[PDB]
């Protein structure tokens, strides 16, 4: 119930909202169905539409017009925006030159420049080129302020999980906004884009933007505006805030356009039709731009135009039915489109099983256009498991492609010409950024970036400190001229052992052998300087990765290897090597086969064993420095050690044979040499973080020796690659994977072929960022560079992500 017998006179617009049951004057009262009975009349005047005219100027105020053209209009703060063009011979903002902001230019009474967020829906990257000659405003403050080629957006690519993520810092699994459609077993309630349910505080986890700003005495304006409330009437609100006294006056504004999303849908991201939204946004711009400029606030406001996703020609006729893969069809209930989400339609129904499911949609039509995933499997860089929100089981469809349930649900609800919501490193899927202002830089461009980054971003150009979230904190410094975040590095936690010769050889009882008793001083000083680091300079090229929990580790080095090795969980944290452009793969010799040596640096009750390998039937063991990559024979036996080898199962170890026999030598001959670290990471509660010992679900079979769910690979190099790896003087080049370490390759539908016909496609689909992989083993990497600290925390960020330019 609403009191609407209430009155809006003198409260349009008003920041703070009123509680029920008296009526609303807000921005959002609409939404609502609260606003008081004359919010129409007095809020949403429309009278002589939004310009001025030259028969208007000087004109005597009519109370009733949208906005004004007569001479108290700018201390009013109502002006019409081209006011001052039509009226007092003005440019608009557009016609000036570009001329560098240096310092703020601020009227007095701003105690800090405003931050103005203008977010525009479905604005796919490449619209900023192919939609330049339709858009001059977008272009003046790209090609003026700051700009990346395109922006990230996190998965699924939807409208509400973007803006909330854009608000928070936050992945959508952490701040709980997982889809536009949600069921969440706990509350038993279904979040949906249409109705009030959404509106539950409920729903929504961390702490946006406008609460961080509030907390710390910062006012916002409302980042909300209810869809029936024209653009025009969003710019006038916005200037006619920034003219409040100062005690009153916000900080921080949000506008939103719903365009160019709403066309895309209708015509595809390309669609002749969507010239004209393009043209709209840009003269909204324009509008805001003038504005500013008539308040004198155009080289004092910092403006970021963002977007949330882009858009992909889909059409109805490119529907996957399930009907057509399960008998049970009936038994289910689908969150369809460009993502599947999958649970039983009856939590009575003892006979639903998601293992027969999971088989029946896997790899059973020729061109099936989805994937199915229990969620822990799917590509950690997703950040998309950890909420009781998301369903056990996911379809990630492929670009240009739906999924639905049957057929019926397609022309019982061709329509649309595109959507968005497939996964985030698709080309089609990338959005824009611009950042313009006295805090951001002048005619920069920088590279891409995601947008869980701008949080904190937005945080230091209010000097507020950010809430706790996913971004890193100071990877994003290079747009910005001042306000730089200027972080310490990490402090270790434990510091290593250096283990020497401590144990004789029959001391240790592991069931192993090797095929070694083969017998010069010209050599075996030599072997001694190996292993007290004599080689470390040339494998260890950004220090040793530090350990940001406490544990017990020692380090061992080798000639052809440097590790971290683990006492507790019986393997190596990392094991780091450097492989030149002109090394020389080799076999693993026939007699060296099933070769594993006790390592006499280790306590026989800190090692692995062979003998639980050979008991388990199902789990076999691979080595993290790939002996066919030794430096000579001699070299080669030390990659047999105990203290290298990790549990591998069989289909796994034909991935990662690939890669170490055929593809590190590959990057180092592409990249002129590369640096390799790899390791195992155990995730099984899938939280993204580092597991404790107490989360461990698998061990190999008898023992104490834990079993990865995934292992990681971080291989960097010179970005100019005229440049050796091991003699670089500038800046790195980086990618990196996490891949899963299953007991099949169900996930690689072409898998029975040779290893070069699928392998690379799944590591690449498995692709990672430095930072991912720092969360999932508590290490710190790149301490010892010659690089700023900021450079490395943007490093450490890269996604190599494989799509075209
Ligand atoms: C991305 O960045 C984010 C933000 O930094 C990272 O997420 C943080 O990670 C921390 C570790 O996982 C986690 O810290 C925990 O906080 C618990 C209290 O949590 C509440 O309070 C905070 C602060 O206001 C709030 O933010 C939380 O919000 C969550 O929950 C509500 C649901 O009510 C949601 O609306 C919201 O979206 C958010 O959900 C997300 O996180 C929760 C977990 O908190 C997930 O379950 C959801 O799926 C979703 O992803 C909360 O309202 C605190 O209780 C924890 O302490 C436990 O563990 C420690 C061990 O050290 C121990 O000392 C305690 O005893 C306690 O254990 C007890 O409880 C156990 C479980 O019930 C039980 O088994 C034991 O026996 C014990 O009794 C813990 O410190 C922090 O909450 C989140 N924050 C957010 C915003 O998500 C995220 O990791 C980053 N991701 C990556 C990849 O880096
Ligand atoms: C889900 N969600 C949000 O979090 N915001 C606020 C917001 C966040 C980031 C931003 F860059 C601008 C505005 C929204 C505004 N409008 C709509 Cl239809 N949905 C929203
Ligand atoms: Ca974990
Ligand atoms: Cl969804
Ligand atoms: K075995
Ligand atoms: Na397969
Ligand atoms: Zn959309």
Same mark, same amino acid.
């Given at each position: 119930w609403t009191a609407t017998s209430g009155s809006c006179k003198g409260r349009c617009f008003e920041l703070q909202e009123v509680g029920p049951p008296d009526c609303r004057c807000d921005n959002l009262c609409k939404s609502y169905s609260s606003c008081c009975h004359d919010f129409d009349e007095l809020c949403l005047?429309?009278? #002589?539409?939004?310009? $001025?005219?030259?028969?208007?100027?000087?004109?005597?105020?009519?109370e009733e017009n949208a906005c004004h053209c007569s001479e108290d209009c700018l201390s009013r703060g109502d002006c019409c925006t081209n006011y001052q063009v039509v009226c007092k011979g003005e440019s608009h903002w557009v016609d000036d030159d570009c001329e560098e902001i240096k310092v703020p230019e $601020?009227?007095?009474? =701003?105690? #800090?420049?405003?931050?103005? +967020?203008?977010?525009?829906?479905? =604005?796919?990257?490449?619209?900023?080129?192919?939609?330049?000659?339709?858009?001059?405003? +977008?272009?003046? @403050?790209?090609? $003026?302020g700051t700009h990346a080629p395109y922006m990230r957006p996190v998965y699924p690519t939807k409208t509400f999980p973007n803006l909330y993520t854009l608000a928070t810092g936050l992945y959508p699994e952490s701040h709980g906004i997982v889809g536009n459609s949600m069921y969440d077993p706990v509350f038993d309630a279904s979040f949906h884009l249409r109705g009030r349910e959404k509106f539950n505080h409920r729903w929504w986890g961390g702490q946006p933007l406008w609460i961080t700003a509030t907390k710390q005495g910062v006012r916002a304006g409302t980042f909300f505006w209810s869809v &029936? +409330?024209? /653009?025009? #009437?969003?710019i006038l609100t916005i200037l006619q805030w920034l003219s409040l006294p100062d005690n009153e006056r916000p900080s921080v504004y949000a506008f939103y356009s719903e365009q160019p999303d709403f066309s895309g849908h209708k015509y595809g991201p390309f669609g002749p039709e969507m010239t004209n939204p393009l043209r709209e946004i840009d003269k909204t711009v324009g509008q805001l731009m003038d504005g500013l400029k008539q308040l004198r606030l155009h080289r004092c406001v910092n403006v970021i135009f963002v977007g949330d996703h882009g858009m992909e020609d889909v059409t109805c006729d490119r529907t996957e039915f399930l009907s057509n893969y399960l008998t049970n069809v009936d038994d289910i209930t689908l969150v369809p489109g460009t993502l599947g989400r999958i649970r039983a339609k009856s939590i009575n129904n003892s006979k639903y099983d998601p293992k027969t499911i999971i088989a029946a949609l896997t790899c059973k039509k020729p061109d099936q256009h989805f994937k199915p995933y229990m969620k822990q499997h799917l590509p950690k860089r997703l950040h998309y498991a950890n909420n009781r929100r998301i369903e056990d089981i996911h379809l990630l469809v492929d670009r240009r492609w739906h999924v639905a349930r049957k057929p019926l649900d397609v022309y019982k609800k061709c329509f649309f010409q595109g959507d968005h919501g497939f996964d985030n490193k698709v080309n089609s899927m990338q959005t824009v950024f611009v950042g313009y202002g006295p805090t951001f830089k002048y005619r920069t461009k920088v590279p891409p970036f995601e947008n869980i980054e701008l949080y904190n971003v937005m945080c230091d150009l209010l000097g507020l400190k950010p809430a706790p979230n996913n971004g890193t904190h100071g990877s994003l410094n290079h747009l910005l001229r001042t306000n730089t =975040?200027?972080?310490?590095?990490?402090?270790?936690? &434990?510091r290593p052992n250096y283990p020497g010769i401590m144990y004789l050889q029959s001391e240790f009882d592991l069931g192993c052998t090797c095929d070694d008793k083969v017998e010069n001083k010209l050599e075996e000083l030599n072997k001694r300087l190996h292993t007290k680091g004599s080689t470390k300079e040339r494998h260890l090229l950004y220090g040793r990765p530090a350990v940001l929990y406490r544990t017990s580790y020692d380090i061992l080095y080798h000639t052809d290897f440097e590790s971290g090795y683990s006492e507790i969980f019986l393997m190596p944290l990392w094991t780091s090597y450097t492989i030149s452009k002109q090394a020389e793969v080799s076999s693993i010799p026939e007699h060296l086969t099933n070769c594993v040596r006790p390592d006499v640096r280790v306590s026989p009750g800190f090692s692995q064993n062979c003998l639980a390998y050979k008991n388990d039937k199902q789990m076999s063991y691979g080595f993290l420095f790939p002996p066919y990559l030794s430096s000579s024979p001699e070299a080669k036996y030390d990659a047999f050690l105990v203290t290298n080898m990790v549990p591998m199962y069989p289909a796994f170890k034909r991935v990662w044979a690939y890669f170490q026999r055929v593809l590190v030598k590959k990057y180092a001959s592409e990249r002129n040499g590369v640096n390799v670290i790899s390791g195992p990471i155990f995730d099984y509660n899938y939280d993204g973080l580092r597991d404790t010992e107490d989360e461990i679900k698998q061990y190999v079979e008898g023992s104490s020796i834990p079993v990865?769910? /995934?292992?990681? &690979?971080? +291989?960097?190099?010179? @970005?100019? =690659?005229?440049?050796?790896?091991?003699?670089?003087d500038g800046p790195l080049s980086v990618s990196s994977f996490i891949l899963p370490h299953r007991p099949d390759n169900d996930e690689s539908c072409n898998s029975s072929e040779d290893e070069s016909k699928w392998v690379e496609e799944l590591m690449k689909m498995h692709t990672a960022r430095v930072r991912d992989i720092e969360h999932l083993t508590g290490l710190d990497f790149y301490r010892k560079t010659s690089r700023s600290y900021?450079?490395?925390?943007? @490093?450490?960020?890269? @996604? /190599?992500?494989?799509? &075209?330019?």
């Open positions: 005047k429309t009278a #002589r539409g939004w310009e $001025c005219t030259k028969d208007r100027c000087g004109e005597v105020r009519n $601020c009227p007095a009474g =701003f105690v #800090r420049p405003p931050l103005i +967020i203008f977010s525009v829906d479905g =604005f796919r990257a490449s619209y900023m080129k192919k939609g330049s000659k339709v858009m001059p405003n +977008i272009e003046k @403050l790209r090609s $003026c &029936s +409330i024209p /653009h025009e #009437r969003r =975040f200027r972080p310490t590095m990490p402090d270790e936690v &434990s990865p769910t /995934h292992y990681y &690979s971080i +291989i960097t190099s010179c @970005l100019d =690659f005229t440049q050796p790896a091991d003699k670089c900021s450079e490395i925390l943007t @490093l450490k960020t890269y @996604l /190599h992500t494989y799509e &075209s330019e």
